[PDB]
């Protein structure tokens, strides 16, 4: 069925979809190419949504709400365990 060369991976318990690789050539180990060459030579987690531009997404009301919320308590708890040992200026 599959055009060669191919690699196929599947899960024996079917808890995964089969996935594939088909290349023009299998990798071949090239000892002739020179050192140091190989011998083979976004999305917001807070808003749970994809964006086209970061800087504008950061200004969106969805994000700006999250940014100011209580959700960073988890960070602050660790932060209030560390010792500040720098000189701070007015």
């Amino acid at each position: 069925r599959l055009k060669k060369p191919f690699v196929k991976v599947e899960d024996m318990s079917q808890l995964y979809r089969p996935f594939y690789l088909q290349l023009t050539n299998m990798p071949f180990i090239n000892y002739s190419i020179q050192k140091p060459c190989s011998p083979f030579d976004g999305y917001c987690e807070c808003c749970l949504q994809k964006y086209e531009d970061l800087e504008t997404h950061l200004l969106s009301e969805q994000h700006r709400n999250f940014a100011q919320s209580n959700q960073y308590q988890v960070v602050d708890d660790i932060v209030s365990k560390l010792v500040f040992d720098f000189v701070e200026y007015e």
Partner: protein
Amino acid sequence: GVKKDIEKLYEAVPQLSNVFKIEDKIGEGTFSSVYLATAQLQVGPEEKIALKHLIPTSHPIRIAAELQCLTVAGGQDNVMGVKYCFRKNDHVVIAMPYLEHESFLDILNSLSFQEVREYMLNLFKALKRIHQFGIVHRDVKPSNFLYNRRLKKYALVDFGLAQGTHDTKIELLKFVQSEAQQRAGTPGFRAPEVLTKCPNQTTAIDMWSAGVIFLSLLSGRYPFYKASDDLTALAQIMTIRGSRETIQAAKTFGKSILCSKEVPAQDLRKLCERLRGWNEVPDEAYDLLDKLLDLNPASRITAEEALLHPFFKDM
């Protein structure tokens, strides 16, 4: 340029202005940027500081997890520690001691054999430490293991991809969902049980990664496995370790691999020597490499086992 970035950093986290003279950008990744800064210590000396500014699209759990790995495991045994952390809403900046380091590419083919031993020893100390705490780094590769050849100092950094073992001592790591369940790393340093989406992934995945590093060091080639996706890295692995051997080992972890071209396993000494005290590399070197690149994650050597390997007699 960088000047505009620094200014935006200060503006994003006003408290930094009171403390740091931010001098340069020294790192940029998909998930963070890193700056060189100078500060004054209450105890007297000025100290160079690395400021890691995390991207504000990052989940606070993910942020806290990295910070916690650094707080708990770091500061000791070639694992980077944290000095302080500063936040302003979604902008978090982690402040660390700055370690001046080489480019891996750069010193790759100029290291002595002894420096290779020392490098690998010191990496295994760091992996031993983090694995004690039940941290799977998941991104062990030369850019995350900082090396100062002159002072002979080392530091494993970047816990932005870390996960926990099922009994992890780092409480927060339990909230990082498994990639396997449903942030990827570099295909070329990822173990075959990772590449094949095995649900159970243990600290052995970091040991494979150190095996890939050792392989670059012994062959003089970096990046060793040049691949833009996971299965391409896997096809390349089968070329090194043999496709039958890989297909066999993958069954022991619940995965069935079909490969249309059978390729044989390479002798590791020959492979490295053809590619590359370099006149008398001991058998033990290639023996350790074989144990790190064990295709079976259950039998793969552990970090405390590696440190006891005769390769490191007597250091």
